[PDB]
Protein: Intraflagellar transport protein 172 homolog
Amino acid sequence: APANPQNFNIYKRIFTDMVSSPGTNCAEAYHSWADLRDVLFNLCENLVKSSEANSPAHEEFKTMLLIAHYYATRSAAQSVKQLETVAARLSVSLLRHTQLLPVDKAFYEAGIAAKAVGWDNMAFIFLNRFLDLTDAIEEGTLDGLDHSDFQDTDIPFEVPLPAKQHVPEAEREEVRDWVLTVSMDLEQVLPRDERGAYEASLVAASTGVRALPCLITGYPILRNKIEFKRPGKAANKDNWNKFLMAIKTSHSPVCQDVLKFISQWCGGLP
Ligand SMILES: [Cl-]
Structure:
């Protein structure tokens, strides 16, 4: 029994528990995500001071912080109608972090959000993958999966297989019905951007330059980059403006909280 003076184990465990907890894909979950975000920020604030910065534990906690920020910003976006697409893109981008998230949950959420904003190709691909992952959970192996759908993406293929199914059976079976019906026709490929890469992918498989992920949607910044004082922190000016406009028109406290955090974390508005 050794001591953990910096509490790495505690914070990692609460991150893990939180992202596998139920009922977290709604606006009402904002404060639980923001809280996780905030404690992780404070932790990273202490790592740099304590000079254990840039050890793989510091960097993995930075990644966990980024993930908690995506989730909190997602709940904020779910609070007002005019940010629906933002919320949807956040669950799409979270698919790249499924080495750290229950992967069935992640694909379920990406697929449902995509479907609700009318992105039916992505909805079909993500929800089919979700069904395959629920079966693989039941079977106990991942060797049944076909990774052809995501072969030139930053979506990881080797991921932890969850021991339990995150999504209740009724929701699984509604997804199963819909996927079966749609399967009877749509083009089932993920959309590509001007790079010839999957639009949500930070790595352009073609070129090989890693794009920065937008702080608002998670998507690769391809144009109109605006940079924050902290290095490596950028947003697409159009996403930025969309979020600021939603604050201007709605006075959303959870969106203003998101804005406050981005300013504190990246060192002032860009
Ligand atoms: Cl520790």
